[PDB]
């Protein structure tokens, strides 16, 4: 009877922990936030670059389109008629910033055959090929290289390369007329030319109705082959924490969560000190360790982020400067990811107390007894899966977007297995190998290989049911 | 022999009942009705707001677009050249009505940090923060709050909030010139401003060729974050019933259905009294009780709806007023839902007489024998399903429309399992966690977990067949 | 040895027959024909109604759009600059024809409540409500009713109704200027009004390069609820057969096919005369009877169609008339359908000689021994399938296009099972019952019920393999 | 121990070989190449033909659109302001070339019935119907036929026909003004008329930043039924190889790969000389032979291609000519295809050393024992699959794009099985047979026939596990 009562006590404690965690994670969420970013992104990406034009920021194709956007839709969205409100609600915080990364002329070598017709070549962006010399009129921060440290920047993982936080930057103005003049001055002096490899536009807004910031980042990359590759980022933040009663309730819930985390840390360490050799012999102990580690990491990230609020205080002293909220947004994204993973893994631990009756124990035994063969056939299946992915990358890699990178081929093959196919592009890219690849993949994966998993599961379930009937 | 004859008599009676119910439910449906609403919705939602503009009602983005629609496409669709026929057949009944819901300034608290730059804040719509004071010129019903009781209104479940039936309303006119003047007067005095949270446009039409009304409701919501969220509703009604011979035939069928339902009620009550100890132990008795309860609820709703025809009589006395058919449309929708569910559950009861031979009995035994294990593994499977849904909500909640609400995540995961995927948006929202979530979900759900249902069914079928073979 | 050699002889004869049939059916096909209709349909449907307008023929919405098409894109497509070639290759044969079907005023009864505001009502199209009296100026065939017999017409199965071959028709002219004048005269006198229920535009072209006709039919329906429902039909024909060497080769193949069919008829009749009582005890005999009946029907249709070449001869005598090729196109479509079905069923008969070794016999025994239970569970599964379809029709019937008709619901549910879903529209139509219907359908159909077929097949295969190992 | 250590040595050697091959195949790929072709194709295809027009090169519909493209978007893309750079990076090499294929008047025979109205007919393109006589002004190479040998051309496999390398060609100029004059002169003299059957536009560019050429080919076909069928081809080439350090590293890797291939060839020949009769009894020996043959073919193609760099040398002597890189592009495509297949098959051989423990051996034995029955049921299943495909071709062949060719039907049926359906077009093409075909195909294939594969696999797995358990 002691075992059942102890299990019930553990179940009740874990249920309380689960309710606390769910309350926290839904308190840090709301429907108000999705439409915030939806309207912001629509305004800044979906609006045509100009009345006559049709291309938006989403469909930029050249430097001329980027200049039209910068002098056009961007200024329309940013400034609303001394203080701007991106809508009638969202105040524009301070000043926007524009930054570019540059590459040296001669960072690549032209073949000796063509040196008579081609004199200048610019390599793809890299830390080695980066340009750090003044150009243009050399008047101000837009024409002089500023290091990452002096710019208080950080690296950004772009579509085709990873970019540093340094470059040539200009701080725009509070009003539309001044910003337009600055942008026109930049364009006249040819700010963007052959050496440009990336450009960033950063600005943040604040919504007092719901007490949420929004950090915006627009990146346009200029590959060595010509054209542009636009991208965007809209990240809401809650820098100010305690403004309402629900905020204090969530603070209390967070304190309770920290108490629970410390209690679990102590409990797990106590058992580790005795069973350390065989502690990882059970999956539940590994799950408990993962949960506690993730929760501790989340707590540490939260503590670090809460002390970074001093950047907001610096901005509030003088509002004519650029508010650097990129680090806060990055750490908020990291915290959200870690909290989501912790919640997911806390949910999975519910299987520990799910053996109510003989049926649940039957199913759990079937699933545990089936893992050894499932892993082996997973290796076997994924060998062929990766062979097919490599063939697809080598065949359609340069033509089809779905196969443009070795990682994207895996996702495309998963989608094809599910039923989300784009066979027209595959057939267009290669009229002989495209159809052969598609047909053979579909056959040997959907029709045959996918059924080995189910055969293993079926045999294991039947064996377990026959055995446990005793 | 008595058992077989009694079962045959029951089967014949139930076949007659099913035929009557199907006749009723298909008589209350026609192909003419779908194209009615199709043309109405194409006229009002799909037409461009103006000749130069591209945005329609479906794609409104701001208060300016809403004003352009109200002064533009709405008047074009409403008035066709004293009486308006909306294509050439649908008489416009009475006048339309426009109603807005409002919020008080100061219903939220600004953080003390930003009180020097922001003075006014309006909270999200709620009954507590609702505004009930006059504004603007204070001339008429458009500038004074009218309660739900005095407005004969009712609540509406919107996209982002549930709204009351009160607010500030104006009754438009019969002709285009008067309505345009009223709308221009509203716009000049700034009817919509920071405090607006919702707006409604209501009107109904009548088609004499097919004898059907159409109650229309256009709702535009104004979130606290800016922008607009349009929505619509086109609900045909049949207030006048006995016109043609088929209508009298359907009335006779309804009388027969009522007699059948009374007979079944008496039979079920007698069986409950006789076999109180075994009634709820059988699934068929539960199905019979569900069917009888749903049919009684449908009959009650129908009786209430017929007594509600008095609203049409009030309108017919004076045609210069607004016909309030919202309640009739709501109850028609409820009746349709109840009747559809009753039909569905009446169809399922055919399984009672489906045991013709050994094959059908074996199949039914197999289905009823694995229900115990199917429910347990359904619990086990849906624990992981909801864990994945919660992770998806916490990760893509603020970026992807498909995961914008906790309920939307479940439907999106069902669609992903089927094969309807939107992986591009998932990868765009999170380039690391998006692919991991998608790949792990697909693997652990489609490839492995979904096959446990199949293993259970296969093992149970084999066991049942082996047992019943002897 | 006797059985093996007789089977070998039968297999050789049937392989020759199959080769002949495949040769015929692929000789009556060519890639040249798909692009013929593709260009015709792109020219007539896809092109905008006018330079300023955006609506196509596919997106007509009112009588004004239809008039603009008739005076606009239609004349541009028809006439190319006495003889017109709809492209630089396809001669326009004779003149086009326009025909409308009409309904009487007062074919429905207005409710007594509204008789003071509505005086005229036109019912949906039917043979009883059809109008047969002159209207308008009463000058010519466009304003007088012409019966189906005198018009040499036939019924057409439209989208919302089935239409007769009678009505009010006008024969257009050979040149653009005359046709435009006729259409303008029709429009000025108000040819289309409240009574119109359908309109037809018929014309045919000839392409001498590939020796193919193309019979075109554009139908626009005018429901009693307003609006228009466009539809089209492009049917290539081969009236002139024996021109090239391949045509004579195909004639020889057709003669060989008739000889084979007579031989098979004689064989089957001889077998029936001996085993008439138990002849239908075998599936292969039923397949043979089906094949022979379908082939005889195809031969009869071909003989009827060849005699119907006299219509072309009548047209060729005077080219200033309307070539009535509608019957030839209808019979060509019927012949193509019957030939396709015959080819499909001839392919299936290849299973008779597929028992090469023990593996094929094992699989055939498994499939035949499984049909008894597969049919029973098919009935069981389709009862629930039809219950769900009826619920979907009653719930989303008036809002969603995919559920607009009772037959559309079945196809939509099949598509949903496969993975082709449109959940957004379902959720929009009903925000409570939509999600419930979708989720419950997906669960109980894909997760559970679809696996009973698979369990039955697996058990039968295992039993057959265990038995035949003896 | 004797077997295990030899297997370990073989595994290590094959792992080294696999790493070398993967290094080579990923060194011949880069993300920079996908966006190269992406920008090129967006510039030339997606760009509107003119400011007023909407048709692209992808949506050409007639000779007028082709002329507008040639005088419009093509010249805008080609020439950027003596030397042109398609972007600010990609130099235009030499001059473009325009070529056309032609057919004789009278290559077909008109029926005697219509010879009084039609005088000229042009057959579909073929080597027999090809025209080879001068036309037009007869001034220069654009109006005289040049054979394939004298044009240094080669055949091209188009959408509706295979085309020779001969025809009437004009070499365009280096500057926009001269090319526009030449194109206008061609258009004025009616270069394209009834006899035209195909047109090609060829040009290549070079990117010094990434050292990659791009051979471009735009083909517009003119069917005998009218209209145009555009198509395109963008193929990057690495003609110049030894420039950077990574290039020398890849050369060393290629030398190592050649040594490995020679060693494997010797090893396999040694075993063949001994096991001549039973060498093919093992699947692994067949895989080794396939790998060796494919690698040798790839090496031969590479040797042929490297010695073919002389074409670039000829062009570099005089840059005022047309650079004929078509053969180099063709052979690069062939080499890429063969290398991809070799990589795929090299990956599959990893299964030989995958028998680590009892689980992997059991899975491999299950897969091996299945092949006998799986092949038989594959024949059985594909008989019905091809019957359905033939029926679909005969029914929807002339109406639906997905069924336009007998090969397209197979791919469309695979897609339908997966879940990628276009049921709307199928139902539109045939309203009776379309739904029947779709429903019966889905049922008999997805619900029933696809489960026999799984039944076989499951039964074999259970048998193998029971046998090997003891
Ligand atoms: Ca699927």
Numbering used by the authors:
A (entry chain B), B (entry chain C), C (entry chain D), D (entry chain A): 214 to 294, 305 to 693
What did the authors write?
Between 333 K-665 K particles of the variant channels were extracted, processed, and refined with C4 symmetry to resolve their molecular structures at 2.76 Å (F629S) and 2.70 Å (R638C) GSFSC resolution. On the lipid-facing side of the PH1 in the F629S channel structure, the large phenyl sidechain density which is normally found buried in a hydrophobic cleft formed by cilia membrane and nonpolar residues (L609 and A612) of the S5 was replaced by an unfavorable polar serine hydroxyl. Whereas the polarity of the F629S serine side chain unfavorably dips into a hydrophobic pocket formed by the membrane and nonpolar S6 residues of the same subunit. We hypothesize that this mutation alters the conformational coupling between the VSD and PD and stabilizes the nonconductive state of the pore observed in our F629S cryo-EM structure. The VSDs of the F629S and R638C variants structures are captured in the deactivated state with S4 gating charges (K572 and K575) oriented for hydrogen bonding and cation-π interactions that facilitate gating charge transfer. However, examination of the variant channel’s internal gates reveals key differences in L677 and N681 sidechains rotamers that effectively double the length of its restriction (6 to 8 Å) along the S6. Here, changes in the orientation N681 carboxamides optimize hydrogen bonding distances (3.4 to 2.8 Å) between each protomer. These interactions stabilize the occluded ion-conducting pathway observed in both structures and create asymmetry observed at the inner gate of the F629S channel. Voltage dependence of opening (V1/2) of the F629S and R638C channels were positively shifted (ΔV1/2 = 27 to 32 mV) compared to WT, which dramatically increased the free energy of gating (ΔG°) by 133% (+1.2 kcal/mol), and 152% (+1.8 kcal/mol), respectively.
